Amino acid sequence: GSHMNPPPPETSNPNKPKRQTNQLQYLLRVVLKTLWKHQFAWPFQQPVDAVKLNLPDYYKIIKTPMDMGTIKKRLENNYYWNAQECIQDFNTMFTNCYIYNKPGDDIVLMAEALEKLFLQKINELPTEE
Ligand SMILES: CC(=O)N1CCC[C@@H]1C(=O)NCC#CBr
């Protein structure tokens, strides 16, 4: 896409050690599945296209972009070594939305609904086995 949007986060790298764990399987099969299909998922399912949204300051503000499309590819590609890496990616996606936008805002209300569901699912994350 546009040269004015940054390259998206890495989803493949042969140099990075990778593992499947039961927690990571849970994050794909339960957590990501549940959030992906939620009514309010759609603004988070791909990187922010700052050109299409006419937000030329977006990547001036947000220097650690993350989206659930990236997270889904990372899980499907077995990119992570542990669950914490993937939980941190979800936390970074929510925080970016709250930093860029204002407490009133539609997208913030949507992210807050998704975050509440994500935290309920993390409360049920199994012990690593
Ligand atoms: C980080 C963030 O803002 N996000 C995540 C999803 C897209 C959203 C955004 O920028 N546009 C939505 C509205 C308004 Br103005």
From Swiss-Prot:
Effect after changing D106G: Found in a patient with a neurodevelopmental syndrome; uncertain significance
Domain of life: Eukaryota
Site of covalent link Glycyl lysine isopeptide (Lys-Gly) (interchain with G-Cter in SUMO2): K60
PTM notes: Phosphorylation by CK2 disrupt the intramolecular binding between the bromo domain 2 and the NPS region and promotes binding between the NPS and the BID regions, leading to activate the protein and promote binding to acetylated histones. In absence of phosphorylation, BRD4 does not localize to p53/TP53 target gene promoters, phosphorylation promoting recruitment to p53/TP53 target promoters.
Tissues where this protein is expressed: Ubiquitously expressed.
Domain spans labelled Bromo: 19-125
Record site feature (Acetylated histone binding), residues: N101
Effect of N101A: Abolishes binding to acetylated histones
Family as reported in the entry's similarity comment: Belongs to the BET family.
Function per UniProt: Chromatin reader protein that recognizes and binds acetylated histones and plays a key role in transmission of epigenetic memory across cell divisions and transcription regulation. Remains associated with acetylated chromatin throughout the entire cell cycle and provides epigenetic memory for postmitotic G1 gene transcription by preserving acetylated chromatin status and maintaining high-order chromatin structure. During interphase, plays a key role in regulating the transcription of signal-inducible genes by associating with the P-TEFb complex and recruiting it to promoters.
Domains (record comment): The NET domain mediates interaction with a number of chromatin proteins involved in transcription regulation (NSD3, JMJD6, CHD4, GLTSCR1 and ATAD5).
Other notes: JQ1, a thieno-triazolo-1,4-diazepine derivative, and I-BET, a benzodiazepine derivative, have been tested on tumors with success. Treatment with GSK1210151A (I-BET151, a I-BET derivative) has strong effets on mixed lineage leukemia and promotes myeloid differentiation and leukemia stem-cell depletion.
Subunit organization: Interacts with p53/TP53; the interaction is direct. Interacts (via CTD region) with CDK9 and CCNT1, acting as an associated component of P-TEFb complex. Interacts with RELA (when acetylated at 'Lys-310'). Interacts (via NET domain) with NSD3, CHD4, BICRA and ATAD5. The interaction with BICRA bridges BRD4 to the GBAF complex. Interacts (via NET domain) with JMJD6 (via JmjC and N-terminal domains); the interaction is stronger in presence of ssRNA and recruits JMJD6 on distal enhancers. Interacts with NSD3. Interacts with NIPBL. (Microbial infection) Interacts with bovine papillomavirus type 1 regulatory protein E2. This interactions may serve for the tethering of viral genomes to host mitotic chromosomes allowing successful partitioning of the viral genome during cell division.
Protein name: Bromodomain-containing protein 4
